[PDB]
Write a protein that binds this ligand. Sequence first.
Ligand code: MG
Lengths: 363, 357
Amino acid sequence: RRPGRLGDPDRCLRTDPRTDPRTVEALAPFGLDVNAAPAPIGPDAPREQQLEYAMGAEAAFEGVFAALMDGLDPVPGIERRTETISGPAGNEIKLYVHRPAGAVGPLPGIFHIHGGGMVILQAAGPVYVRFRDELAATGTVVVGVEYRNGAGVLGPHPFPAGLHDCAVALDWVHARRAELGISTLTVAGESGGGNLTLATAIRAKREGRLDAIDGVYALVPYISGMYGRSREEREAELPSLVECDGYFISCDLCAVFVEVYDPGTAHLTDPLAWPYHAAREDLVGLPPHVISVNEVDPLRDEGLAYYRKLVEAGVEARSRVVPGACHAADMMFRKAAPDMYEATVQDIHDFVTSLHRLEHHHH
Amino acid sequence: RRPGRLGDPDRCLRTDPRTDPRTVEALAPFGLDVNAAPAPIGPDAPREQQLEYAMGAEAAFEGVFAALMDGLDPVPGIERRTETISGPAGNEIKLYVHRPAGAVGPLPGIFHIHGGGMVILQAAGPVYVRFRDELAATGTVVVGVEYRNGAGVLGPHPFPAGLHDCAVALDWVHARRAELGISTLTVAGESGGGNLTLATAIRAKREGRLDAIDGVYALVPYISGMYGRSREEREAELPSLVECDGYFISCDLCAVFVEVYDPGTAHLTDPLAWPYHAAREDLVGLPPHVISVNEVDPLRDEGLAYYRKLVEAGVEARSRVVPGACHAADMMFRKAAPDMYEATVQDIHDFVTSLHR
Ligand SMILES: [Mg+2]
């Protein structure tokens, strides 16, 4: 029969033979070996209740991530510094810089955009600190942007606040490459940070700012906005949204996050809010991209769709799949599945090291 | 607004702003800067006439490839030897072996399957000798299999003759990794050799022979068999078949080649003939795969489809696109577009060095 919840509506990560069993056992303490509990509200709830729900979801996910990162041996030899810059709207934006302490000369730069559906989680949290140390350790300079969120502790700031913060922060890092010891500059991020990464490149082309971007690496991108569509609609367009619904994340939670990010959903088909909607003309001329998708992630199909769009637009594009992986498993299970974690860090290192500096090429 | 011949039916490689212009000028001596001339026959022609046509098409493509390889400095430091083995059906199969001079120790192996729609061209021809030298130079042992073709000078031998010859030759290389100085073994090939590469892996799983295959690298695979469908059918299913029809290769030529390969087309939906038809159960458990596709290649969409299938079956799969590239441009334009050629050679090298037994 068909895989996952297409073949058996009651299947979950534990009962899906495709799931890496180490990750099932790593999620069991949190109850996330089985299908996520349903959302107690939907996208028609009053905004006040949606923000309360998102604040609780933020805390709940942060508890999971803190426990998964707890007790890890430090990454050796990383220098960390925080910079604080002026945002577009009188707001301060923190940048978390990571580099190998011994590094002599310029290294590839990674402008890292954290996930959380553009509405929750902090770049200051342990799962992101760890990922930026891990990337830096390979011989990169990593700059993690703390942008305004749609909700939670760093919210509420609707679309396009976080996207504007990412723009200003990218411009600041690009203007300081030499000071920061950066050669090429890649924008990277997972899930909602994969969304902001892809939209950051689309916007940079529109604004004449593409000198800032030598490459783009999007992991498990959260880009369709279509989580609130019926089971039949989701099955017809993006079947992974049914096949793997409730595998770590659920369409019901994501549909509330869509409304939280953009109240009224005037930008539901705007490629800067939801890059799945990008037209060919939005993508022509973009720098090299990687789209990394996860096998048992509901967001798998929308990530594959974006790779097809980039191919159709002539971008120097690549894609990969992480076998056995739930949404963001390759960034979460540094303890339980270190090989999966290492393979993603090493793929990103291999991509950024391959890049040419495009500001110095005729364009 | 739609690219290529979807937006302007008269567009051709030269007038498509997407094409790498260096490849346009490189194809102009052959008249292949403009849309390929139409086929004088169709798949309904008598078999005798289809074989005459395939033999002329073979000579014409060989002439292009020879001219594109002429005037190159040889790849230095390559040792070449020919092995001759027993095939499945009393036939001898040549194997073209390439290795770097003075390599110490085992190197990744590449079992290379040439293209030509499974019906034309020889592994002994200069475009394949060059590509195997180029791969060897990066630190690999390359084995080019000379299998039975559906047509041309090494035919006619319908499906599954070529596939059977690839299976026996792969088994022979696998059994001799030590003697050949090979560590890991990758099956690789472009176009019709991309078809045979992907079908070789699906067949190996069925036959309990997957120990022979540590990875699979398919370039611009020729795998749908759907070239003879109407313009409207092709547009609906695999739009690149219309968008880039006539860019170097044409659907009319390909539709005759389908019939030549498998006369009567009993295997038109058989994944061993046409891997686009693979079911999930055919792909589950396969070793790592790369699918490389070319931007302005009519075969682009079928290759992207196969990457999706591998992802949906849990294979450790990757894909790439070559911008500005017609069908097989990354293997043809070593003179005019050396950056494009080297990027494909280095991606294959990166892949095979990443594998383990
Ligand atoms: Mg006959």
